[PDB]
Amino acid sequence: APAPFADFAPPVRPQSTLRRAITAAYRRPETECLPPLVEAATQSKEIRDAAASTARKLIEALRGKGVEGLVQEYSLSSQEGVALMCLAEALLRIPDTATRDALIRDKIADGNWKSHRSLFVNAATWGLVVTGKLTSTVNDRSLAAALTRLISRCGEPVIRRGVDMAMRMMGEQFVTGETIREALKRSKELEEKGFSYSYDMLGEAATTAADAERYYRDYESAIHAIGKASAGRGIYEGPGISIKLSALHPRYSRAQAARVMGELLPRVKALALLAKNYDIGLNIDAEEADRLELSLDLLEVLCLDGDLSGWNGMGFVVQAYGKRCPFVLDFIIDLARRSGRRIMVRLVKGAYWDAEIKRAQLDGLADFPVFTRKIHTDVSYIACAAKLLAATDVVFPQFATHNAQTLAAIYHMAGKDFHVGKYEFQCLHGMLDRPCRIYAPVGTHETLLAYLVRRLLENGANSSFVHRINDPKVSIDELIADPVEVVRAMPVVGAKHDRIALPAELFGDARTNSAGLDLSNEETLASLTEALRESAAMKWTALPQLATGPAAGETRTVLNPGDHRDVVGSVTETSEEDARRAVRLAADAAPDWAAVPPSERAACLDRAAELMQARMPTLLGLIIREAGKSALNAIAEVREAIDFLRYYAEQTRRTLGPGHGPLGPIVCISPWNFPLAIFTGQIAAALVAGNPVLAKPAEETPLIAAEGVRILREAGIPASALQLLPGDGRVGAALVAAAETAGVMFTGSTEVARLIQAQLADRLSPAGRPIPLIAETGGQNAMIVDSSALAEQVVGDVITSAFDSAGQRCSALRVLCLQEDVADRILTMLKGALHELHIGRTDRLSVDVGPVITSEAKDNIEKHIERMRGLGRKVEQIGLASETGVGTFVPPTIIELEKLSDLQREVFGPVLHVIRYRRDDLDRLVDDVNATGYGLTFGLHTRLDETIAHVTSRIKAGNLYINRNIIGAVVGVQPFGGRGLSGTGPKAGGPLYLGRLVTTAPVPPQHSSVHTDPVLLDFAKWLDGKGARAEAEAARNAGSSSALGLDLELPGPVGERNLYTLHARGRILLVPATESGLYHQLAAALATGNSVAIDAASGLQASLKNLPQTVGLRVSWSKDWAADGPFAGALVEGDAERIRAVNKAIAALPGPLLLVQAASSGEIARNPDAYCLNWLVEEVSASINTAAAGGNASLMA
Amino acid sequence: FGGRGLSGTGPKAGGPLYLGRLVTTAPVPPQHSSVHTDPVLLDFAKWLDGKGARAEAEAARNAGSSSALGLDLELPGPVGERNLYTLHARGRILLVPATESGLYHQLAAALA
Amino acid sequence: REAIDFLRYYAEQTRRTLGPGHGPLGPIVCISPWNFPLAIFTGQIAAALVAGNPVL
Ligand SMILES: Cc1cc2c(cc1C)N([C@H]1CN[C@H](C(=O)O)S1)c1c([nH]c(=O)[nH]c1=O)N2C[C@H](O)[C@H](O)[C@H](O)COP(=O)(O)OP(=O)(O)OC[C@H]1O[C@@H](n2cnc3c(N)ncnc32)[C@H](O)[C@@H]1O
């Protein structure tokens, strides 16, 4: 077998001194980066005065010199203007110019535009054009009303003017031309006036091999057309081309560096050879920060390649908003000297700022790779311009900026001696005597959208020059302010922006965010390689760790699921006798652990979090080898464990006091698929709530569990409070059945949860109440995609959601639902993206999908696939390398289904099912998704507000995701947990969790609602009318205490809105004994928005005579509980023997595990909280990607 | 300004629905739309699809979309005041149909 | 003030909405109370007139 991690992430080439200086600057503090840039950008008083004069002259000229004319002419509102341009866009899709005009005159202008994909799919873009503001989603009902109104008011003439305006903008303003031939023809004019051109064919972010081939042949054909037109003018006076490397390979990333050098580089070389033959410029555009250093490896190989010698047209963009910018320039200038090629360097400020802030926050990295104050980028730009102007003999500087102040400072910096070829300026199409190159987009209306939104966002940001030059409140004096001197006079030079949170500070004072690792950073990969190798040399063990000490037992090895030859460690498993002994020991330790004050227990959790953060690299290595995870997923799992510890610590400090007594010994049974995070989360919550814990890890992953217990014990948790019992489900069953077990936390399959519930149904606590079970189980998770979604975004989110971790996430996408009109195109792209995944042993950074956990899991998954294939369903699978034979692998698989009912149970593997639906059947489809009985995660890709409102109001799932993937819920941000067959609740990583692990629940932070259920109020009035005054008052009190209607936004990363809401659970089974008991149960259920089914065997029908219709609509009587489900909960009244018998009957009900609450008649009389309203509402988490339209509205401020 | 029940017929004076009552075909008032769809309307449309009443099901879906039920606006006014305007269900509508298709169209309108 | 506001509001609402397909009813009888003898008088009449109806 190959040595573990011997080939984890070797760099493409040895890192030179100059390359290492780039990497070292990646994320340094802004206060460190700025002072040297200030020093380099300083110019003399005489030059600064001359620059301000020149900048003033430029600005006065710009202010002394379209859609707004149309809006003014027809007195359109904003929404009418947007709707009119969406209509014109649609009308221009009709090719035959006479056919379009007939549709306008005879059909459209007569109002019936609806009868002739939403019209408003691209309205966010036209919103930007009309209003200057970006909205993430489209209010399509508002736009439809506006379009009806404006046509009914103004008729054919306004439509004609709209069409002619959209024609001019999309064919002449957004682009230089629709095809390279058209763009070249239109360039003759300004070329005669001294301008030059760089053409951009508008490809980026290839998803499939076919996409990358299409962009390649677009670039190749453009080079021919440009070179033919250039006709020997050369690289300075003649036109050139700009390319994006992300267009040329579907896996352009550091993780796939070997494929990039082997497959992408030859393509760039072939394009460069063609540009050399015509002697035109070929420029590599700069993209995301994590592609910068990868692109340098391509630049270096190309500049050293003798086949390209004799040609100085190779160009490369560097972004001044980047902290590495000066060091990148030092590297390029030295490469120019070594190679003897005069590299064309386009200096830009940077186009991806919002995305870089969001990415660094999501990844929990030390700092940003870009500046956070706009004035810092301006100083960086000027400093880097001074560096470039000092090297014009070896590089050709190209100053790409529209900012008149930046231009004037550089113009005077460059001095009086100028010749064509020394340097040039550049500008974007559609926005002194020095040459000026126009960056010219070329493409059809369809292909233009991503670039166009990015462009229009920059122009609309309050800090941007284009927005300020057009703002009449901004004086010229403000516009010509020297950024260098403004920064130099600041109190702390280079301070971070006050309103942008470092990743560590996302949650402010609540808790410290967990820190991740940058797998694009070569220093990180080099140190992580050594730590991973060292972790594979360790002799990992898992032992039964009882309060008294380690116990003996049957010992066996733990094998790497990706290669059974790799022994990871050894586990000693627990005998059923020792399991029962551990519970007795935990029972005897319970009072001492309960007596540790809650603040000290929380301090132990924070200490364990610090220890896990420090040990992350070693922990990664164990998770990769024991559980078959990739390094990316292992990082996220360790972060989740750290977040659980810190989140439950903070929730404890906010809530727990002397009256919230522990339950007693808690049995925590955890799954193999998150063998550290869910393991840690369950144990941490139970411990910090004051309960001693019996930890039973999954049989497949005991080593990381044992290491998590060692860390918790090292942090201060006493051995009597946390005992580790490795073994199989028989150990789990022995623990559950133990007499002193006071509660069970289970995460695993629904079937096993059902077996645990059955065992607990016979049981009562010493107080005669049911034993609490928190059971978080499977999901049959769906995603619905409509024809307004962006295919490229969808495919990326689908590939991640279905096949990350080999589909072994509870949240994994199982069923993709595609609107019929776009299904073929998305399926084609999805299959193409499937075939770009690398499957193998996960100790290589290049591996995307690892093994499934066992051969039994493999056999079960492959049996499902073959059944589908035998039924004739289309099955797409990628081929597995022969190396996978030594482990247990299932290839990522796509299966096309006819109906949603083709699926029986959850298939816990990398198997995506695809169904198609007609748009008018969307509501029926949501019904069919709900009808599986599951309710865990759900995704929706759409830009249309009406569709969002419809789907999110009708779907029944615990975790909703809009325009993003459906995996990787973040503790305290997307509290995680479903309903129905997916779980009992409360949600892990949410504010109701700890209250389930104490005998009296505390009031969670922010847990309240000003809304009162109206049926509850109707019931309390009815009670008053019947004379039941005490119960009527109790009902009103329940109405006020209920938190139904709570609606919160949770702190998190920029570019995302994370919502948390409390809803009704559904239909609650009521099993009353007395009339007053029934009234209290009904009040509790109605106050939390639920309907009820009342046990008809109680004989209390006469107690509810003549109910108001509003209350009767919610009440049903049940003689056969199993026939009237599924229920979402149960309330029971009776003595201990009655509660036990009812609990057994409820456990036998088919379907979901019901959260049961029981009370005696006397407790109902004595205790207004006899039934806890916290457990009668349902938590829903919704995470909305608000950057999905292409940028961040809030960050534009 | 204007009320319901014994207080008047509506539409409100000084409001955006007023002029539409004085023409034979009412226009779409400014800002008059809603992204919400009544769930019972949706159930009715599905029922219509199930019995093959395709044109009525189409009409029901279009009523569901064009309904402004759930509109919720803040109107411009003086500082120190928040002035809200919302559209709710009216109550129980008396339906006097003559034909089955007429009944389905009336029910769709009321449920939407 | 209210009479002035009715006039200007219904004028603006007309500019935002009314087109050739929004035909008038015909003669409208406007019956007004004594407690707002200018404002409600004007509001009813202005709305009927601007919608294209002659008023009694
Ligand atoms: C003129 C020009 C600009 C760019 C390119 C070519 C030319 C000729 N390159 C293009 C190719 N790919 C880009 C694309 O969208 O597909 S357009 C280019 C650019 N940017 C890249 O990252 N890679 C490239 O290959 N070009 C865009 C350029 O980076 C910039 O976005 C705009 O030109 C605007 O800059 P400006 O100097 O003319 O305007 P200013 O307003 O003075 O500055 C705006 C910039 O300031 C930065 N910024 C904003 N807010 C900030 C905060 N809070 N902190 C730190 N920096 C901030 C941003 O960079 C913003 O763009």
Ligand SMILES: NC(=O)c1ccc[n+]([C@@H]2O[C@H](COP(=O)([O-])OP(=O)(O)OC[C@H]3O[C@@H](n4cnc5c(N)ncnc54)[C@H](O)[C@@H]3O)[C@@H](O)[C@H]2O)c1
């Ligand atoms: N909703 C969630 O949060 C969530 C999270 C992760 C995984 N899951 C689900 O976990 C399942 C896959 O993981 P798994 O293979 O570990 O599930 P599993 O049900 O096979 O085993 C989970 C745990 O239960 C133990 N166990 C088995 N039988 C037992 C019994 N009779 N009594 C007591 N304990 C018993 C096992 O030893 C193991 O520790 C999937 O179905 C997944 O959907 C759910």
